[PDB]
Amino acid sequence: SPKEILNLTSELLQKCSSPAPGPGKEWEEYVQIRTLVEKIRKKQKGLSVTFDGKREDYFPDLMKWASENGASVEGFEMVNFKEEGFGLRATRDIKAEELFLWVPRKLLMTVESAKNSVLGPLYSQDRILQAMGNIALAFHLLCERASPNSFWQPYIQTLPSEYDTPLYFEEDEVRYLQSTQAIHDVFSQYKNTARQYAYFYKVIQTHPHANKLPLKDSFTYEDYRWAVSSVMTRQNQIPTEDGSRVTLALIPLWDMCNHTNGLITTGYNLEDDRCECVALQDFRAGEQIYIFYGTRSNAEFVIHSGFFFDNNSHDRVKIKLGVSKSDRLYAMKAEVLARAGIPTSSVFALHFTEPPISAQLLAFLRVFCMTEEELKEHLLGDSAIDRIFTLGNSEFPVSWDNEVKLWTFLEDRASLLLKTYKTTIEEDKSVLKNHDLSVRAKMAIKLRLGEKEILEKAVKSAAVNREYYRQQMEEKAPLPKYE
């Protein structure tokens, strides 16, 4: 058996270290990798370390341990909510902007504490651990998990045992994502995680610095999938105690808060050396306490956080654009873009907002559609730099003709992108209405529906902007000038 697992992990390492097989072969590669992982997983015993109690049996010890080390432990309780899982619920009224939660640094698990732990010797030897603090955190979490006397056991024993990151999806649930933008990130994450498991499985076997690790005796694929899912759904960037560098950390007690829309209200307090969270809004006693995780898209929430957020006001899709080297004005366009601080080709974003495009994408699109005469006025003379300064500003177009060109282009490109999906928006809505689906399946379908709805709104916005500037051109309206 142990020789058999080392055989299978060796094949998995070579499979997942091969170069990308071409975008048209990525699903087939994905299923191939899945077949190998599941064969390994079926020959292993799940999580190496499991605990006897239920998850909520351990929340008291978390509170007592947090209280002994200076953290806030009054005014909230842990409740298992159906919609979000376990979260914090107010036991008293909490006003907006009240400092209700604080976590001193001693309680955190960080890349620094990973360095000074039993993982220390291996950390200093392995180049992946040294370059990637997130993988270092995940192994830190596993080693302490398998250490019955760890200082962080009260935290580790209250963590979830399973997640809804795509690593946990069934193959048919990922299949709903075929033809979307997000499925490539799902492929990458699956291949990354399998390669990393096989790589570190062999490294732990061969390195003398790994001799004292509990992982030397048991390190399962489930161990690794759980560890990286724990880190990617909960990790945070905080300053070092020095204040001059940033590290990655897990923050106990605070990371029991679930997400709602709003603004970030959590910051690090270097002087008291602790994380501090002020209430995002009033929370009456008996209401769930929420925080705003960050301005992430639903693709990021699904893939890295394991949930899909309805009414995500910061949702966005990618759109790759670049000036073609066959364009006769490539040289001039590249220079104007360069003087504006914009690459010649890039991945921009389309937002689900009243303008779908950022200032940077607006500026790129204006240069993309400029005539030679317009390019020369952004390259030469005492007003050229003034002209570049305004390129990202909707209020000061280059010309009415330039605007009509760029909104026509965007309407056509977003229309084309919509035509590359396997389903329509109406077909997705019918699926969600007529089929009874798992939570993971629903995340996948709502994700692919959301991509198309953003593109459709971009088509509508672009068509409306096209008509607006086409009117200004027919009426020969004076162009605005920044003065």
Binding site: M132, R195, M232, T233, L248, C257, Y268, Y293
Partner: peptide, 19 residues
Amino acid sequence: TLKYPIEMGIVTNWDDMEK
């Protein structure tokens, strides 16, 4: 505002072969 805002679940790069 907050000198060190903290983003829960900040997206990191896990691609060890590119990085």
